[PDB]
Amino acid sequence: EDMPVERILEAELAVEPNDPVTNICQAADKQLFTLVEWAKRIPHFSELPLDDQVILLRAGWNELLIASFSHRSIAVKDGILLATGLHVHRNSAHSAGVGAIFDRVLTELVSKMRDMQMDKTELGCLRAIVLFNPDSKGLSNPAEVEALREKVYASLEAYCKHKYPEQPGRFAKLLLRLPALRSIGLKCLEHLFFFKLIGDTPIDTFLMEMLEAP
Amino acid sequence: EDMPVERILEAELAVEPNDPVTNICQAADKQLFTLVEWAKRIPHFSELPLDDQVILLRAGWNELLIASFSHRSIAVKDGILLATGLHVHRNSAHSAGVGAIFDRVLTELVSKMRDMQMDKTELGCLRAIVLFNPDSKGLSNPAEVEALREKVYASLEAYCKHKYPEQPGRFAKLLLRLPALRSIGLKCLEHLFFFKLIGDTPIDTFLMEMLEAP
Amino acid sequence: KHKILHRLLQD
Amino acid sequence: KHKILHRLLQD
Ligand SMILES: CC(=C/C/C=C(\C)CC(=O)O)/C=C1\CC[C@H](C)c2ccccc21
Ligand SMILES: CC(=C/C/C=C(\C)CC(=O)O)/C=C1\CC[C@H](C)c2ccccc21
């Protein structure tokens, strides 16, 4: 109850108006601060204990950021638009060694979002569903986080069917992108950990904190 | 069109009536043969080009097998029931070094399936949704695999709501388990690759083939 | 490659 | 741990 798609949409509209890898890490650090402000605008999120908020964000920041720059790259040819205003072309990522994952982002995420014209409201709800991850370890009250997730996709299903009556499978189509997002989120982390290990590629404070333990 | 939940249920009912790790690998090799017979019983699957069938199975065997022994372990205390008839207790997995992942299986999968009383028809459809993975690389016709997936969750949503009218969020609850399944499927592979690398822990032919390249 | 899998699917 | 994240959430 009390999980209007209007509040979710506002969260999205409120937080967003040479080495390609270095530019990506710099952009992720920038968005991490914005991610916190976005979360706060999500209904009931701020009402959760401070500790559970840290857990939810530290467990989903990567998938939440990946979902954002992807949907933002829908109108882009073969690349993505970074929050910093920089465009990372497919060939540029390839010439940097991170072509395998970058291609997975374009094919499994960016392209798919574009094929179904996923709107901002739909993007917001999905991210909200990710934020409210009841499987996050250490949660003081996983059941509560679970109840919130259910309220999100309940409002999302209502949005669809009503906004896109002619598309009865839209709701499932959106939810069936989370697995790809999960798989891609995990691989991106692996790369970031390797980048931190090798030493090359500068990494800012907030990004570095997210790469902490656990 | 033509994706009846009755045919999917029959596929499930037709394929199923000391080192814990060694027992797990032996069970996965056993089920791999059964997985092929199960797939063949899935509508339209066999109609796909032989090559695409190899791709779909090699890309989902791990998540498909994990979903199966989990649902089978619903009545189990703190462990799982292997196809070989052997029970792997939580403490046994822990004393073998694979306690982290085994716990994720019990909490994120086994327990959840039990909390919602996921039935065999529901289990069948989910696996079918996994089998029909349109994101599998190399697919001769990904669109077709996509159309099949849509027919599966379309029949699944129909099954629910009609079988469980009082639970409007059941459909989404089932689909929202795939991300956990994807994450767990990937970690299990990592372990298997390490087991093959170290040399210890016997690995049969079919399992070994699945651990091939790509 | 994929000897086993292919043979099983063809049968 | 998690200095930054905590400070940002509290504000
Ligand atoms: C976890 C992560 C986040 C990036 C977030 C960004 C750039 C957000 C934004 O700028 O809006 C890291 C990625 C995101 C995806 C690209 C392709 C990538 C490639 C190689 C290594 C890492 C990464
Ligand atoms: C990919 C995989 C499949 C197992 C399949 C089985 C046992 C099927 C079955 O017996 O029905 C491997 C697992 C499945 C899950 C358990 C906990 C595990 C633990 C450590 C390493 C690997 C594995």
CB contact under 8 A, C9 and B209: no
With an 8 Å CB cutoff and a minimum of 3 pairs, decide whether chains D and C touch.
Answer: no
Backbone angles phi, psi at A71, to 5 degrees: -55, -30
Quote the tokens at residue A37: 């402000």
List of E strands, chain B: 79-81, 87-89
Number of domains chain B is built from? 1
**Separation between Cα atoms, residue B119 and residue B160, nearest integer Å:** 11
Indicate which technique resolved this structure.
X-ray
Q: Does A54 contact chain D (CB < 8 Å)?
A: yes
Distance CA A130, CA A124 (A): 10
Write out the residue range of the structural domain in which residue A109 sits: 1-214
A135 close to A55: Cβ distance less than 8 angstroms: no
Instruction: Write out residues 1-11 of D within 8 Å (CB-CB) of A.
Output: 1-6, 8-10
Q: Residues, chain C, total?
A: 11
How is residue A172 written in tokens?
């499932």
* Interacting residues of B2 by C-beta distance below 8 A, sequence separation 6+: B43, B44, B151
Ligand nearest to C-alpha B184: 2
Q: What is the best residue among A188, A189, A190, A193 to mutate for testing ligand 1's pocket, by most ligand atoms within 8 Å of CB?
A: A188
Residues of B in contact with A107 (CB under 8 A): 135
Joined together, the tokens standing for residue B28 give 């996965």
Q: Using CA coordinates, name the residue in chain D closest to A61.
A: D5
CATH code of the domain covering residue A72: 1.10.565.10
Residue type, B17: P
The residue type of A123 is: L
Whether cis (ω within 30° of 0) applies to the bond prior to A214 is yes
Q: Whole-angstrom Cα distance, residue B187 to residue A143?
A: 25
Q: Which two tokens mark B204?
A: 């049969």
Spatial contact of A20 and A44, defined as CB atoms under 8 Å apart: no
Name the closest ligand to CA B96: 2
By C-alpha distance, the chain B residue nearest A112 is B135
Resolution value (Å, 1 decimal): 2.4
